[PDB]
Design an enzyme around this catalytic site. Structure first.
Site, PDB file in Angstrom:
ATOM      1  N   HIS A  99     -68.505  24.383 -60.185  1.00 24.02           N
ATOM      2  CA  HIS A  99     -68.030  25.688 -60.630  1.00 24.02           C
ATOM      3  C   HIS A  99     -67.949  25.775 -62.150  1.00 24.02           C
ATOM      4  CE1 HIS A  99     -66.208  24.177 -56.902  1.00 24.02           C
ATOM      5  NE2 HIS A  99     -66.524  25.353 -56.392  1.00 24.02           N
TER       6      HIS A  99
HETATM    7  C1  LIG Z   1     -70.250  23.313 -54.698  1.00 21.93           C
HETATM    8  O1  LIG Z   1     -69.315  23.043 -53.678  1.00 21.93           O
HETATM    9  C2  LIG Z   1     -68.933  23.949 -52.942  1.00 21.93           C
HETATM   10  C3  LIG Z   1     -69.432  24.033 -51.651  1.00 21.93           C
HETATM   11  O2  LIG Z   1     -69.814  22.976 -51.150  1.00 21.93           O
HETATM   12  C4  LIG Z   1     -71.080  22.445 -51.471  1.00 21.93           C
HETATM   13  C5  LIG Z   1     -68.894  24.986 -50.796  1.00 21.93           C
HETATM   14  O3  LIG Z   1     -69.430  25.181 -49.707  1.00 21.93           O
HETATM   15  C6  LIG Z   1     -67.872  25.834 -51.200  1.00 21.93           C
HETATM   16  C7  LIG Z   1     -67.631  27.067 -50.350  1.00 21.93           C
HETATM   17  C8  LIG Z   1     -66.665  26.715 -49.246  1.00 21.93           C
HETATM   18  C9  LIG Z   1     -66.763  27.377 -47.937  1.00 21.93           C
HETATM   19  C10 LIG Z   1     -67.031  28.850 -47.835  1.00 21.93           C
HETATM   20  C11 LIG Z   1     -66.597  26.540 -46.691  1.00 21.93           C
HETATM   21  C12 LIG Z   1     -65.470  27.059 -45.807  1.00 21.93           C
HETATM   22  C13 LIG Z   1     -65.360  26.145 -44.610  1.00 21.93           C
HETATM   23  C14 LIG Z   1     -64.075  25.875 -43.946  1.00 21.93           C
HETATM   24  C15 LIG Z   1     -62.997  26.918 -43.910  1.00 21.93           C
HETATM   25  C16 LIG Z   1     -63.889  24.537 -43.269  1.00 21.93           C
HETATM   26  C17 LIG Z   1     -62.466  23.994 -43.342  1.00 21.93           C
HETATM   27  C18 LIG Z   1     -62.379  22.828 -42.380  1.00 21.93           C
HETATM   28  C19 LIG Z   1     -61.336  21.797 -42.491  1.00 21.93           C
HETATM   29  C20 LIG Z   1     -61.031  21.152 -43.809  1.00 21.93           C
HETATM   30  C21 LIG Z   1     -60.586  21.359 -41.256  1.00 21.93           C
HETATM   31  C22 LIG Z   1     -59.116  21.727 -41.405  1.00 21.93           C
HETATM   32  C23 LIG Z   1     -58.381  21.485 -40.108  1.00 21.93           C
HETATM   33  C24 LIG Z   1     -56.943  21.783 -39.982  1.00 21.93           C
HETATM   34  C25 LIG Z   1     -56.061  21.952 -41.186  1.00 21.93           C
HETATM   35  C26 LIG Z   1     -56.331  21.924 -38.610  1.00 21.93           C
HETATM   36  C27 LIG Z   1     -55.986  20.555 -38.040  1.00 21.93           C
HETATM   37  C28 LIG Z   1     -55.713  20.695 -36.561  1.00 21.93           C
HETATM   38  C29 LIG Z   1     -55.339  19.543 -35.724  1.00 21.93           C
HETATM   39  C30 LIG Z   1     -55.348  18.137 -36.257  1.00 21.93           C
HETATM   40  C31 LIG Z   1     -54.941  19.789 -34.289  1.00 21.93           C
HETATM   41  C32 LIG Z   1     -53.452  19.531 -34.094  1.00 21.93           C
HETATM   42  C33 LIG Z   1     -53.256  18.590 -32.924  1.00 21.93           C
HETATM   43  C34 LIG Z   1     -52.382  18.917 -31.784  1.00 21.93           C
HETATM   44  C35 LIG Z   1     -51.212  19.845 -31.961  1.00 21.93           C
HETATM   45  C36 LIG Z   1     -52.667  18.271 -30.443  1.00 21.93           C
HETATM   46  C37 LIG Z   1     -52.288  19.181 -29.277  1.00 21.93           C
HETATM   47  C38 LIG Z   1     -50.829  18.986 -28.924  1.00 21.93           C
HETATM   48  C39 LIG Z   1     -50.342  18.982 -27.533  1.00 21.93           C
HETATM   49  C40 LIG Z   1     -48.867  19.167 -27.319  1.00 21.93           C
HETATM   50  C41 LIG Z   1     -51.298  18.801 -26.371  1.00 21.93           C
HETATM   51  C42 LIG Z   1     -50.651  19.049 -25.010  1.00 21.93           C
HETATM   52  C43 LIG Z   1     -49.758  17.895 -24.612  1.00 21.93           C
HETATM   53  C44 LIG Z   1     -49.043  17.883 -23.323  1.00 21.93           C
HETATM   54  C45 LIG Z   1     -49.382  18.851 -22.224  1.00 21.93           C
HETATM   55  C46 LIG Z   1     -47.945  16.870 -23.099  1.00 21.93           C
HETATM   56  C47 LIG Z   1     -46.591  17.555 -23.232  1.00 21.93           C
HETATM   57  C48 LIG Z   1     -46.280  18.277 -21.942  1.00 21.93           C
HETATM   58  C49 LIG Z   1     -45.525  19.537 -21.934  1.00 21.93           C
HETATM   59  C50 LIG Z   1     -45.849  20.644 -22.894  1.00 21.93           C
HETATM   60  C51 LIG Z   1     -44.413  19.703 -20.930  1.00 21.93           C
HETATM   61  C52 LIG Z   1     -44.685  20.859 -19.974  1.00 21.93           C
HETATM   62  C53 LIG Z   1     -45.947  20.590 -19.190  1.00 21.93           C
HETATM   63  C54 LIG Z   1     -47.100  21.495 -19.296  1.00 21.93           C
HETATM   64  C55 LIG Z   1     -48.478  20.930 -19.469  1.00 21.93           C
HETATM   65  C56 LIG Z   1     -46.900  22.979 -19.214  1.00 21.93           C
HETATM   66  C57 LIG Z   1     -67.373  25.727 -52.496  1.00 21.93           C
HETATM   67  C58 LIG Z   1     -66.258  26.613 -52.970  1.00 21.93           C
HETATM   68  C59 LIG Z   1     -67.907  24.781 -53.362  1.00 21.93           C
HETATM   69  O4  LIG Z   1     -67.706  24.891 -54.566  1.00 21.93           O
HETATM   70  S1  FES Z   2     -64.903  23.146 -61.673  1.00 25.42           S
HETATM   71 FE1  FES Z   2     -64.808  23.375 -59.490  1.00 25.42          FE
HETATM   72  S2  FES Z   2     -65.253  21.361 -58.725  1.00 25.42           S
HETATM   73 FE2  FES Z   2     -64.947  21.088 -60.892  1.00 25.42          FE
END
Ligand SMILES: COC1=C(OC)C(=O)C(C/C=C(\C)CC/C=C(\C)CC/C=C(\C)CC/C=C(\C)CC/C=C(\C)CC/C=C(\C)CC/C=C(/C)CC/C=C(\C)CC/C=C(\C)CCC=C(C)C)=C(C)C1=O
Ligand code: FES
Ligand SMILES: COC1=C(OC)C(=O)C(C/C=C(\C)CC/C=C(\C)CC/C=C(\C)CC/C=C(\C)CC/C=C(\C)CC/C=C(\C)CC/C=C(/C)CC/C=C(\C)CC/C=C(\C)CCC=C(C)C)=C(C)C1=O
Ligand SMILES: COC[C@@H](CCO[C@H]1CC[C@@]2(C)C(=CC[C@H]3[C@@H]4C[C@@H]5O[C@]6(CC[C@@H](C)CO6)[C@@H](C)[C@@H]5[C@@]4(C)CC[C@@H]32)C1)CO[C@@H]1O[C@H](CO)[C@@H](O[C@H]2O[C@H](CO)[C@@H](O)[C@H](O)[C@H]2O)[C@H](O)[C@H]1O
Ligand SMILES: COC[C@@H](CCO[C@H]1CC[C@@]2(C)C(=CC[C@H]3[C@@H]4C[C@@H]5O[C@]6(CC[C@@H](C)CO6)[C@@H](C)[C@@H]5[C@@]4(C)CC[C@@H]32)C1)CO[C@@H]1O[C@H](CO)[C@@H](O[C@H]2O[C@H](CO)[C@@H](O)[C@H](O)[C@H]2O)[C@H](O)[C@H]1O
Ligand code: HEC
Ligand code: HEC
Ligand code: HEM
Ligand code: HEM
Ligand code: HEM
Ligand code: HEM
Lengths: 403, 232, 194, 16, 403, 204
Positions: free
Chosen positions: C153
């Site tokens: 950038h």
């Molecule tokens: C030069 O460079 C550049 C480029 O590049 C070369 C670029 O391109 C860009 C341009 C950029 C873009 C436009 C790209 C944009 C792209 C994106 C937006 C990509 C971003 C992607 C990421 C970084 C990933 C981010 C991910 C996140 C933050 C989310 C994370 C999520 C998790 C880890 C999931 C969470 C896990 C859980 C909660 C598990 C589930 C939990 C449970 C409870 C399961 C169920 C369990 C049970 C059932 C057991 C319990 C039981 C219960 C509930 C009891 C009740 C029973 C029942 C079942 C009902 C720029 C600026 C750049 O300059």
């Molecule tokens: S100025 Fe954007 S990556 Fe360094």
């Protein structure tokens, strides 16, 4: 919110689906212990999907790093051992729950008309599950993994003409190697999970089309009140949702007990030789399948001929597909079937358990004799079904479910 | 026939002695490559500097895996069989098998390395703990008399009543640093360390599982009440 | 059904829901926790000793320190005189808001003026900027006097690692903790003696 | 206590 | 067969679903070029799933072997180069087709009532596609891959307080490493594909609930024949199925031309610096995003502040979500909207294309100025819509579809 | 910088064989081609396997092995100040014109560590390894007379063959890709005719 749901309902049949599938969906009110296992199968499938996604974040599907990556999960990844044990215990519990599910289907004649398509989708689910578990067991790349995969794929070498070429094409190599590992990993991680999810969707859709069976085999839809609700029917939500919540809590108690105290389960959920890295040149003194494949293994081992053994093992699973047409009983539930049907269900369950028990060990004289006898009985339970379901005298099915 | 060993994974001193034994007498041929020095020190309560000075001989860092210089192919050529990685050997064979195996080496001139093993017949492993155990042979020694499980001890002294048997493992006197009990304790500490290495999450697993089971009992009470109620 | 006891049903539903939500959080704990840096990640890094006597005037070398590139640039005089002339175009000319060792010059951001050791990672979204020692490149404009040009950038830094005003980069390029073990040898990773 | 427990087996006698 | 379908229909909603969704589902008869792209997006999604499954059989998600495994696919795997090119050109074609789909929605007001949920599910699909494509582009582990992952994950570092901790938690490491590669591989290969399949299902279900718009913006449901079939309505099967077959064949012709003659497309489908192994210490002198991410990157490059630029990109994506409530026009189609709406749609298209074009090259003075101007115009297209859709005078909407 | 255009012919087996010889002798000392195998290079260049093993495999590797080299990237980065990148995909990373101009743009520059600089790649860490063939090239680039085995045309042909081999290495599927794509496009036009006729028939 009322306004939000009104807005959604004009644009999405959310309330319509909810009232068609869970609420205002009237299932028989006499479900028992044996009807907990569909929801438990769903829970175990969700557990497998989540824990497998997380294992994939750290697993390396190469013969050089698969075992090391599994140990990296077990030791280096924070709580990675928990996720791995959830996955292994969940595969074993998937097969436990699914076998009890199928045995419920056997007990109450739930495969019979109109649930033939439900049963066929369930059997497709079972085939997909067997393929998924077999391909997953190769992923750790332990001794058991490698050698079980080697034997199971050499089975494809038993086809008289194209057997060797087909086995080589499946392996992707002249032997089981990292190519087979990566291929089975791709199949196990995406392709078969997608197939299983689609098959589960089709299975539940078919069931909801034809409605659930019940332990008494009573067609509750015959008797309906002035509102059209079956007299022996209650809304699935909330009554069976809360019942299934209780069942899920009990299952989770057992599942977590296994995970945190006996994850190996005496070497059956996690086999001891599988904790040694795969060695292409040293095979285990006795190589045996995971317990949930042991019965069919026994059948294959009961046949002296190799090709006929493979054919018999395949038919052991294929006959369950035609089960809906083998059963000629006028009644569904074993409660009202004749003594012959009860006796043959007992024989089939005992033979299945004995086949699993003796396929888990090295061959023995008594073991081999009983495995052959149980193979005969297992196939006779199906082959003789069209006859002994007619010879027997069945009890009159009550108009209203008992309880 | 294996010998039972009561392995206390909460014994930090025993695990430390086992780790020392593994690092000195075992890491010459056996790796523990699925296990890091840092984690071993953290779990055994060994200070990082002490772990570096006393147990890391290969120049590896604290966070490095317990790798060794002996390659599996080289060692397979040299010994006739590759010395397996021992991180998970406790899970592969069990602790009783390891305890019986490391105490079952006896002189056998017919063998490539002059020794055989009762537990692992014709094993390709040399008896590397012979200096500690001493010369062990298949000879005649006193063994407790047993008749259909009728095991005789001395009522007064409490020691076994013994008769002579000529197919028993006997340590030649004054041939090793440690006596039978001392070598038993050495092997017990080593097998305790190997048991920890195979399952380093055991204690934390038990604690977390206890809490999980308590929570699940609580949740079961609530779900059962919500079920039995609402089913009236 | 005869007279369902509401409130009791509501209380049981609420309590079961809350307990199940707590269990869901607990079951999420393994999955969320496994995403924190593992033991593989925590291997860390040791200080790197770099021989800087062979750097030609107006040239830079890359040193691998803790997985990051460190620009070690032997600064000729002319750019040292030019650097004070740029204080009007720099967001933090005195390095008041940047990260650098307490013992480096606030303006030159180095132990000795003729050599600059800079953590070569852009302070906006974190890449190594391109070293552009030329005076007035056509692409970098006539006001350029040498420095660093971020290729993602276009963040601009002067040869001292100080960012220009109104760039995506808000901070000057970090200065690593380094010393001069000898007149021509530095070590990156260890602070200099007071 | 730990240091004594962890003493390396091999002892080397050095000049001086 | 008639008997077979009678058997199935009593057990499955086969014929009913077929006649509710494809046959006897009456879509407007005046679909034009712009209505090919939903079916083409479906086809490209299927292609991505299949080719990605086959790539996963040979890909090694480790920093040591990812690039080497990609080259192994290109060179050692029989036809593996074909599958890899299908996959990469299919990602590019997915974004081409999806952008044309979204632009159809803009042209004909297909986001307007009653299709707000259709549009929102489409935007969720687009977010999932952006995330999927980014994580897939990290997988080759080239220079482009590594440094794009570094920049995009550091975007989360812009959050004032929890930014750095969140970025570290997303990385799984103190820098982009094999941990990040493996984690993004897991998300890309299972999690987001499953989410995308679910979101596509929800999207199509919402569309079928509310019905499809048409280029004229005429609500064909208002006028119906005596049979209840809209006068301007034709059964989707067979007419639009065959039209979509023709569109699919044309798309396949272009797709295969690119695959077998121009797989790189001048370095815009397969970027040249991504053919170099990822180097943690050497950032390419031209570190630019894939073309379909350039327009937003440009926006972020236009803002001289880090956090403000991140928020600007986020809002550039998020404003399309609220688009259904920004458009206060009394008519759906651009054909019958006022001159202001047509001018502003032209302005938005030109601004998006200019942002993408200048986001595809290194910073320049004219490039920077035009990027800033086009960012302002892109955001004004949305911010001013609630105003200029009311200021303008709209032509009357015909009671019947023109053609 | 301004590049010199070169017409690379990937059907010229003789040119690709000469380029492979030059790469094996003058370039594999520091650069790997580790993403391609000797066997595939032999098959695509028309080189018999025995001839390939005798003439181009110097590392003791098997015919089916990757064209790896002894010089590790870390050691080379230390020695030269920059790691010699793997050249299997360099023709795609840089293009054939860039390679052709770069390998002919080395000139003598005493201020540089290796006594040379490059017009295409200023301050490059490559020693001028083809100096024996081209001769002494000095700054406009001019070759000192009677300093290399080859003249300007002969060295240009050598560099062209080498760049052709590099172009093949970057894209070994190009010829098969064109051959398969021709048939795929023919079938797709054939199928388009039928699909269009079907659509026209139904939309009456
Ligand atoms: C030069 O460079 C550049 C480029 O590049 C070369 C670029 O391109 C860009 C341009 C950029 C873009 C436009 C790209 C944009 C792209 C994106 C937006 C990509 C971003 C992607 C990421 C970084 C990933 C981010 C991910 C996140 C933050 C989310 C994370 C999520 C998790 C880890 C999931 C969470 C896990 C859980 C909660 C598990 C589930 C939990 C449970 C409870 C399961 C169920 C369990 C049970 C059932 C057991 C319990 C039981 C219960 C509930 C009891 C009740 C029973 C029942 C079942 C009902 C720029 C600026 C750049 O300059
Ligand atoms: S100025 Fe954007 S990556 Fe360094
Ligand atoms: C000791 O040992 C032993 C044990 O062990 C220890 C044991 O356990 C057991 C016991 C064993 C068991 C009981 C376990 C059983 C386990 C199993 C069943 C495991 C079996 C698993 C395998 C071996 C896997 C085998 C897999 C096979 C054979 C299937 C292979 C499938 C493929 C490769 C798929 C092919 C791919 C295709 C078709 C590509 C897709 C095609 C397309 C055309 C895609 C679409 C393309 C387009 C759209 C483009 C063209 C466009 C068109 C059509 C034009 C029109 C356009 C439109 C779209 C309309 C035994 C006996 C044993 O002794
Ligand atoms: C020696 O003692 C024998 C004891 C019986 C046993 C195990 C033996 C050889 C073939 C076995 C059969 C093959 C067919 O396979 C099956 C399945 C395959 C079908 C094609 C034919 O029937 C059996 C019903 C049939 C079958 C599985 C039943 C039992 C047979 C060994
Ligand atoms: C400092 O201004 C930058 C430009 C003018 C800047 O135009 C502006 C044009 C508009 C735009 C894109 C800008 C900010 C925020 C943008 C908005 C945020 C909101 O977001 C959204 C979405 C989110 C919602 C929440 C809100 O709404 C929007 C609807 C809103 C929005 C996206 C719409 C559009 C806004 C920049 C002037 O640049 C000068 O020139 C040099 C710049 O580098 C600097 O010179 C120094 O550094 C040079 C190094 O090159 C050396 O050459 C010199 O020697 C050395 O002196 C100098 O300091 C600097 O002033
Ligand atoms: C501490 C002194 C040691 C312990 C405890 C173990 N080893 Fe070894 N070992 C060596 C070889 C060449 C083999 C393979 C022999 C064969 O396969 O026939 C072994 C084997 C073992 C085993 C068996 C594991 C199994 O799964 O069967 C165990 C449990 C074992 N070793 C424990 C060689 C050497 C060696 C080279 C001189 C040393 C120093 C040690 N072993 C030390 C120990
Ligand atoms: C060691 C003496 C080398 C031999 C012999 C050859 N090359 Fe080389 N090369 C070497 C180094 C140390 C570098 C890096 C220089 C730097 O400053 O980064 C290179 C680089 C190249 C490149 C550039 C590739 C790129 O930047 O992407 C090319 C195209 C290249 N080398 C080609 C090449 C050829 C054709 C050779 C045989 C004639 C050859 N190199 C030999 C070191 C050495
Ligand atoms: C029906 C669903 C599934 C079943 C029955 C199943 C079964 C198994 C089994 C038995 C193993 C061997 C584990 C061991 O013994 O160590 C395994 C391993 C593995 N599975 Fe699956 N699995 C399922 C779904 C999935 C999914 C959806 C994924 C990823 C998206 C996945 C990823 C993995 C991985 C990465 C491994 C290797 C790590 C390990 O062995 O623990 N699984 N699976
Ligand atoms: C493996 C994943 C599976 C899932 C998630 C699943 C899910 C379900 C659910 C939720 C139900 C309704 C509740 C219940 O009856 O328990 C059900 C019913 C049923 N399932 Fe399964 N099932 C699976 C596998 C199978 C298999 C392998 C079979 C048989 C081979 C099968 C056969 C049936 C039948 C016949 C019914 C209806 C019977 C009745 O109404 O009593 N299912 N399934
Ligand atoms: C990426 C995968 C997508 C698939 C597979 C898909 C699928 C479809 C299909 C088959 C249709 C009906 C036929 C057609 O309009 O061509 C449709 C309509 C529509 N799609 Fe999508 N879509 C996708 C993405 C999107 C996105 C990203 C948006 C907007 C942000 C969107 C918004 C719409 C709207 C508004 C309609 C209704 C058009 C009208 O009635 O005129 N879709 N979609
Ligand atoms: C909307 C769906 C998808 C999109 C848009 C997408 C996009 C991409 C992109 C752009 C790349 C970079 C390719 C390159 O530059 O060489 C990639 C790589 C990859 N993708 Fe995906 N992908 C999708 C689904 C999938 C699925 C479902 C799988 C597995 C089942 C998969 C497996 C892979 C693999 C293994 C790679 C690395 C190998 C390679 O780069 O060719 N993808 N993906």
């Amino acid at each position: 919110m009322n306004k939000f749901m009104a807005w959604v309902d004009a644009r999405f049949p959310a309330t319509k689906m909810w009232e068609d599938h869970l609420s205002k969906y009237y299932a028989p009110k006499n479900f028992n212990f044996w009807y907990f296992f569909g929801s438990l199968a769903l829970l175990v499938l969700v557990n497998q999907i989540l824990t497998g996604i997380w294992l994939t974040m750290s697993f390396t599907p190469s013969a050089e790093e698969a075992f090391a990556s599994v140990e990296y999960i077990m030791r280096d990844v924070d709580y990675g051992w928990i996720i791995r044990y959830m996955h292994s215990t969940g595969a074993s519990a998937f097969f436990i729950v699914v076998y009890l599910h199928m045995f419920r289907g056997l007990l109450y004649g739930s495969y019979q008309k109109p649930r033939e398509l439900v049963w066929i989708f369930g059997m497709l689910i079972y085939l997909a599950l067997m393929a998924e578990a077999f391909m997953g067991y190769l992923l750790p790349w332990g001794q058991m993994s490698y050698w079980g995969a080697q034997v199971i794929i050499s089975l494809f070498g038993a086809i008289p003409v194209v057997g060797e070429d087909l086995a080589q094409w499946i392996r992707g190599d002249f032997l089981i190697s990292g190519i087979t590992l990566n291929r089975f990993f791709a199949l196990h991680v995406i392709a078969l999970p997608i197939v299983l999810l689609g098959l589960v969707v089709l299975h539940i859709l078919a069931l909801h089309e034809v409605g659930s069976n019940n332990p008494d085999g009573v067609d509750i839809k015959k008797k309906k009140d002035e509102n059209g609700v079956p007299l022996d029917g209650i809304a699935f939500h909330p009554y069976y949702t809360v019942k299934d919540i209780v069942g899920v809590v009990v299952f989770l108690f057992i599942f977590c007990t296994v995970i945190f105290f006996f994850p190996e389960m005496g070497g059956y959920f996690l086999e001891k030789p599988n904790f040694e890295m795969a060695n292409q040149f040293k095979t285990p003194e006795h190589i045996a399948p995971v317990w949930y494949f042991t019965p069919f293994y026994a059948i294959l081992r009961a046949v002296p001929d190799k090709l006929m053994g493979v054919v018999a093992m395949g038919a052991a699973i294929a006959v369950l597909f035609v089960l809906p047409w083998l059963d000629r009983s006028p009644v569904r539930s074993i409660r009202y079937k004749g003594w012959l049907s009860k006796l043959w269900l007992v024989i089939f369950a005992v033979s299945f358990v004995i086949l699993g028990y003796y396929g888990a060990q090295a061959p023995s004289p008594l073991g081999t004799t009983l495995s052959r006898v149980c193979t005969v009985l297992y196939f006779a339970f199906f082959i003789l079904m069209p006859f002994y379901t007619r010879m027997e005298k069945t009890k009159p099915v009550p108009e209203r479910v008992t309880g | 026939q294996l010998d039972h060993v009561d392995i206390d994974l909460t014994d930090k001193a025993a695990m430390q002695d086992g780790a020392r034994t593994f690092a000195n007498y075992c890491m010459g041929c056996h790796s523990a490559k699925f296990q890091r020095y840092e984690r071993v020190a953290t779990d055994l309560g060994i200070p990082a500097d002490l772990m570096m000075e006393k147990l890391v001989f290969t120049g590896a860092k604290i966070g490095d895996h317990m790798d060794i210089g002996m390659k599996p192919a080289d060692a397979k050529t040299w010994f006739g069989a590759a010395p397996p990685d021992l991180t998970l050997v406790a899970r592969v064979r069990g602790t009783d098998w390891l305890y019986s195996y490391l105490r079952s080496f006896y002189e056998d001139p017919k063998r490539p390395w002059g020794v055989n093993n009762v537990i692992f017949p014709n094993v390709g492993m040399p008896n590397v703990l012979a200096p500690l155990q001493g010369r062990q042979v298949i000879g005649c020694k006193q063994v407790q008399v047993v008749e259909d499980g009728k095991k005789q001890f001395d009522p007064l002294t409490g020691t076994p009543l013994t008769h002579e048997a000529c197919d028993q493992l006997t340590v030649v006197p004054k041939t090793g640093e440690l006596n039978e009990a001392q070598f038993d304790e050495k092997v017990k500490n080593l097998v305790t360390f190997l048991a920890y290495s195979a399952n380093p999450n055991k204690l934390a697993s038990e604690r977390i599982g206890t809490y999980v089971l308590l929570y699940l009992a609580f949740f079961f009470v609530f779900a059962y009440l919500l079920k039995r109620e609402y089913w009236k | 059904n005869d007279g369902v006891n509401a409130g009791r049903r509501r209380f049981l539903v609420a309590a079961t829901s809350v307990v199940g939500a707590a269990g869901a959080v607990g079951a999420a704990v393994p999955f969320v926790g496994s995403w924190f840096p593992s033991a593989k990640a925590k291997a860390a890094g040791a200080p790197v000793q770099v021989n800087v006597g062979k750097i030609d005037p107006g040239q830079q070398i890359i040193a691998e320190w803790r997985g990051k590139p460190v620009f070690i640039v032997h600064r000729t005089k002319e750019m040292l005189d030019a650097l004070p002339s740029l204080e009007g175009q720099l967001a933090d000319p005195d390095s008041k808001a940047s990260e650098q060792p307490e013992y480096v010059d606030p303006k030159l951001r180095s132990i000795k003026p003729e050599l600059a050791v800079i953590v070569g990672i852009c302070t906006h979204l974190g890449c190594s900027p391109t070293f552009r020692p030329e005076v007035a490149p056509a692409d970098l404009g006539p006001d350029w006097k040498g420095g660093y040009f971020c290729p993602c950038h276009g963040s601009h830094y002067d040869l001292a690692g100080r960012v220009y005003k109104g760039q995506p980069a808000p901070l000057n390029l970090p200065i690593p903790p380094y010393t001069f073990d000898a007149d021509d040898v530095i070590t990156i990773g260890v602070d200099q003696e007071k | 206590a730990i240091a004594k427990r962890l003493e390396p087996v091999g002892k080397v006698c050095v000049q001086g």
